[PDB]
Amino acid sequence: IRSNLRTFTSLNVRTAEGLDTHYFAVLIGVGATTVNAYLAQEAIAERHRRGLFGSMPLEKGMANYKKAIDDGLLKIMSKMGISVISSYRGGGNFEAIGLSRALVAEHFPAMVSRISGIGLNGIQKKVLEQHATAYNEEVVALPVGGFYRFRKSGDRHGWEGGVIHTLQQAVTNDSYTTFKKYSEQVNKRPPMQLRDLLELRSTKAPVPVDE
Amino acid sequence: CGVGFIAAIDGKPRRSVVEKGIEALKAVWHRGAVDADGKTGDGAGIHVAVPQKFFKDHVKVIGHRAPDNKLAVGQVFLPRISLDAQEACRCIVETEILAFGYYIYGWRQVPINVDIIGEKANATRPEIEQIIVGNNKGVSDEQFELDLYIIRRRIEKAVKGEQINDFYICSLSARSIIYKGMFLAEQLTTFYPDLLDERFESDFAIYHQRYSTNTFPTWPLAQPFRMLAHNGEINTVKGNVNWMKAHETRMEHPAFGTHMQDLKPVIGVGLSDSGSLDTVFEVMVRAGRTAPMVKMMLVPQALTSSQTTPDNHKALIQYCNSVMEPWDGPAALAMTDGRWVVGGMDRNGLRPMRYTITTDGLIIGGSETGMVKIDETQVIEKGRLGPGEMIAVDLQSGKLYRDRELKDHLATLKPWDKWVQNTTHLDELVKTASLKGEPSDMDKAELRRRQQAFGLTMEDMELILHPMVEDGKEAIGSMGDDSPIAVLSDKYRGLHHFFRQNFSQVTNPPIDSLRERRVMSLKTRLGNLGNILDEDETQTRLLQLESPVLTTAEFRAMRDYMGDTAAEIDATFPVDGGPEALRDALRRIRQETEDAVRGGATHVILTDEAMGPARAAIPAILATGAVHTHLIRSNLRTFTSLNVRTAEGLDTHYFAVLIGVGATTVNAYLAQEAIAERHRRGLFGSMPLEKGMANYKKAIDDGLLKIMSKMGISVISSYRGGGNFEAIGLSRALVAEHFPAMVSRISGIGLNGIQKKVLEQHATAYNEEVVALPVGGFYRFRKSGDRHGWEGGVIHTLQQAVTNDSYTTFKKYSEQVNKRPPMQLRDLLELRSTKAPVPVDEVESITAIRKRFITPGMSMGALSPEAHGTLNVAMNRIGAKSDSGEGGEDPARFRPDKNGDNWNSAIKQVASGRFGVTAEYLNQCRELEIKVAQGAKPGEGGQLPGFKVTEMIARLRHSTPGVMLISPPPHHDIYSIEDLAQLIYDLKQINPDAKVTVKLVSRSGIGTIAAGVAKANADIILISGNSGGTGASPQTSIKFAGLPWEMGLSEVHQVLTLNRLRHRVRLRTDGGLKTGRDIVIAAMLGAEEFGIGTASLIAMGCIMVRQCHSNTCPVGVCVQDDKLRQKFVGTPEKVVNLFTFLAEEVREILAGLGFRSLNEVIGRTDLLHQVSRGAEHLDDLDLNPRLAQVDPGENARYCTLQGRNEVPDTLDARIVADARPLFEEGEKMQLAYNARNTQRAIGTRLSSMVTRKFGMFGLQPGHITIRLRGTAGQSLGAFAVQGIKLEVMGDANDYVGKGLSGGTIVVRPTTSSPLETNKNTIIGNTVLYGATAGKLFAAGQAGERFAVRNSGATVVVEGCGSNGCEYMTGGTAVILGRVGDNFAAGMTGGMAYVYDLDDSLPLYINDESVIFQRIEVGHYESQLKHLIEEHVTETQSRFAAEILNDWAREVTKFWQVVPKEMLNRLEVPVHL
């Protein structure tokens, strides 16, 4: 854009990491003319090879996938009233929580990022770590996952069984004390949420609770 | 306001350095506009070192580890209302620090307390935030700032490209950080508590509060700037600014690597003058130059060519002057590149700057002195800066350098002289060819016809050229300029007519180019424009003249020496040309110069020589500008010198314009010609045509030096190209297109008109024979071509009218006056209204109206005693007011006479040479008029030819009989607006009843000043037109300085309104008001009072013959000669008739408009419509900007209460209270009180009170004595009459005994101070300014301009800055010590002795009017002795006492300084 060239080509992406509606949307409105999630058509195939769909043609499985991604989008677009993709494209209708200011400014269309976050360096690093895991070692299957739901996995969650128990306990047996261990269970973890990054110091000396 | 600095001489950080820095800032408010709001101020700042504990901890507390290095901080003002922008801002800020790969620990909202801010300010408050950076790259102190610098610019630049407003990085270094903002200095600590933390420690400080011509607060404009802090103003700014546009074309240095381009323009939009300075100072320091070197390259001291200066220094100076053209203007500076800390002065010591050195190894720089407690006991020294000096500290080595020693050092750095010796002075080469014979090659038949082309005349040749040749001085004249304003003229006038010389009013003072010529200069250099960034001898390789001025001889001298190097462009155009002739002509020249310069050319010669019957000449001025500009616009001007040959040039003005619109060099060739022709009819007599030119040339040289001094500028290189004119009459578009920046508030004609008029005059001179020029009636009415306001008929009719007392005759006069073609702007307005008319009876009354009229100040001296008092009688008879004038008023006159008539005048002036200014004069009135300026001669100050200085006159004025009175152009106690401010305070102190007025002269920019005047407590402001009258004044000012009142008066009306001050002050105007309508129109433009001089003179009889300077008045109006004064027929009754008519004619008009009063129409510009078109060609003016209303439609009403803008008490408040007995019983009294730098004008009120009850002299010396410990602030003892005595044990600031009036003031160090009385400063500047009586004793040295204008006070002091005893006219001035440059300049009358231990006085004194000898007669030797005795008695001065102890050997060491003009006048001769 910056160099007056974008009006000359179409820009088409082939992505391996692409799976659901969101990924497409972002891509698309950050430039993309056309997208192709090629390692998913694959993941689909494998699924269809072990008969997980019926005797449904892959051709058809593909169609469905596409339709969902099409409605995938149409929907993400309407969240902002936009009814048409030409106008949505490249428009940058995101908001970056996490990435660094500098970066987002340098590379993406205009999007806010009210707190710079990591930059190329970190990105680099995390990218590569995850890459080792799949090549600088050997791998049987994808882990389970505990994103969409707490398993007793590595993806933590606020509400995980332990704490829930203690809460329920606390409020059934009705002990403030039990309550008080739940909060601790909850307050002693590593940060998971921005408030988590904030200490509370003050300059007054303590007053008695009764007051 | 103030600047200050503090430094630990040893280099080692401390908290006290900051605590002191605050301490200061708490003692400057006495110098500023206090708001009734309690909060609002113009700006304050403190520049200290980034405190690494404090910051590092911070980074630690978030839980990082503190680096080993220094940690940087950016201090940043973000947009505060658009979050969207704050971001853009922070991304940019981060990106930039990021690509240098440094490190961000991140943002920190600065704590602040906005409760102490006013709304105006909270409104424009940015969001203040710190960003913390780390030197992860492990670079060096020096590299970090360098990089950071390129970063800040990078940001600065990008924000700009983004179009982001309100972003601003105060500081961003790891050495220094700035905490400035819009809040009262006393409250810096409150708005920013960080400062109160003990971790804030520092080896240095730089504070600064500031004032302004505003009500609007911008935050970035508060100082200190990044390297700099400035008290003053830099009048030479547009000059500087445009030079950089070229300086830059070549600046390149290796430290910025590939960065340079991001580096330019070094001066962004929206900077204040100082801001722009800091900008330049910075790049230079970022590229390698120390602080002190830069102060010099940019604010170099004056190279007086004298012994006073070692030769090393001179080299250096000469070096600088060749690289960079100064940045002039009053200037106290506080500076620092990373390491050094410097206090500096401008080349004229225009601003105070005391300092103290302590036992604890600190230096505290200051503007006043009581600014921060220090025990006398620990004072090791008490200095000050004088013109040009610096004082400094090298913090790395913890060494202090005083001026000499510091300048020594810099001399040391390079082979200054060897390098300087590299310049070719093509002077002698040029003088040679002149003596070899100024040629001439035209035959009268030609001279005459060209001459006609530029519409020249006899008046021109006789009146103006001649005197130049003869006396080598320019024509003096009299009476105002009543001709049309050029655009409206009927008769070929040349461009130079439309450019008005600018001059300065309250912002800065103008200089004395006579008494102070040694600091000024006209050096000129061709090809010295390379790398301000370089520091190599190759910078001295350039040619050098000593005047941009060249006689046809010298010109060719040069043009030859040039040669292959020069190029000649034909500034001319065809007449057969077509409607676009001159345009394409102007293109052509523009291009041709391009090619030339590109082609390799290094000098350009622009010329009209080929003017002929077929080619009109392009107006040299236009041609020079067109060329210079386009040259700048293509980065080329840095490659040539640009030299002009002009057939139309003749007077000083024309040179000035040419020069300052580009021209390097000028040659008035067809005028040297015209000189010759005159010379071959032996009109110059014996005198060789060569000596002829020589003179011409000096007249034009002093010519310029003067025109320059009008806006304090001391040096042509800064003046050049600076465009210091204002255009009236030419079109906006044009003036923009082709000349440097100048205002032209109403467009005017353009090329097509210009073309048409140029050509018309042309036909006049090549359409047929021409044996004689026409007579001309420009400087005087002839019954010829040029009209004037005052012309015979008109004068007769008026005289008839006021003499026979007929209003009908009056009316016939005014009709005569109003029925002509437009001559003045108001003439282009119609007055139409929408109300039906009212019956005249119904309007306000004459009694009422005439009271808004006043008779201007016209001095006793300029006018006959008879005329003067006539006026005072008329005005008091009708309950109005008159104005004493620049020159005294006789006190006999302080009573009504047997007939009831009252000769005393109601408004007394106060002007530069404080003429009769006395506690009793200042108290015999209702109003004090500070005269900063008259439209006849804005830049300058009165003249009274010597033969008018009668004895009575001389008695009045305490001047010397029959010796001439030329006044200092600036007031010596008004060098900047705070200064005005303080004069107004003293004035309101010595006279509790009067209102104070400020006479100012219209010019664009007046508006703004007007405001400041308003914030300074003035009650009335008077704007004077360009066309007013003068009894004596050079003719260029009478025809080229000033602007019409219709422009200035509205501008003040507008601006004052726009800042909500317009109700604080009343407005008055004068300038040619002869008629009823002239007075109505002035009201509608905003005026409430009108001044009427000349027409009042004419009623007293003036016939407008213009020999007011000559003392040959046919009629007794302006002449001191006795026989001649007997021909005077003026009468009160006549003047009264004048006013009566005027008012009635005013009422007649209002009634037609439907108003029943004047008030109902002030400001009402909706009642005026511009009609007039008055020329053949469509060339029109835009009178809008004058008619516009700021807040049109209904106004809110601010209640104004009847009285004067009142003022805060002082010590006098108590002193008086404590003196009941004095006033009640007569007792004698001794009182004691401490005194701080913050108490001003102490005693003055006392004095007013005493003068009122016992008179200046009814009390015996010492009757009421008040001792004071501590420090007196400005105006100590000002206007003290006899009976009062003030002992100040401690010390004082500027203006001790200003206007001293027979009172006594003594000042000595504290019994306990260990200081050597005579080796330390003790009182400020402009001490005893204009005094007339009393004594002053001072155990110590005094600063600049000591005893200036003293007219009769006796003083003893142990030393004294430069410019001492200047313009003194009476009194005795002893002086136990060394004495500054130019001592006794213009010292026409008193006497000074001067203990000189090194037989040096010879090297410092200004010969011209004075002589020195050793005491010989023994009554003079005795006089001295007794004073010195007194001195000692009063001051217990050892050093003095000791001189007494060895009288014998010692008397031997003094030097009697006695005025030439006093030699034969003196009772006891000075010689044996």
Ligand SMILES: Cc1cc2nc3c(=O)[nH]c(=O)nc-3n(C[C@H](O)[C@H](O)[C@H](O)COP(=O)(O)O)c2cc1C
């Ligand atoms: C003869 C004469 C003497 C003047 N003397 C003074 C003066 O002493 N002080 C001053 O401040 N202005 C002085 N002026 C200017 C007048 O005070 C006033 O500004 C101007 O005269 C009025 O201009 P008008 O002449 O067109 O009526 C003088 C002007 C003239 C003509």
Ligand SMILES: CS(=O)(=O)CC[C@H](N)C(=O)O
């Ligand atoms: C206190 S001050 O009047 O010297 C201000 C200095 C400067 N001309 C400015 O506009 O900041």
Ligand SMILES: O=C(O)CCC(=O)C(=O)O
């Ligand atoms: O009388 C004087 O000193 C000055 C009068 C004056 O300058 C003027 O009237 O133009």
Ligand code: F3S
């Ligand atoms: S010379 Fe002045 S012009 Fe008036 S005062 Fe005499 S006529």
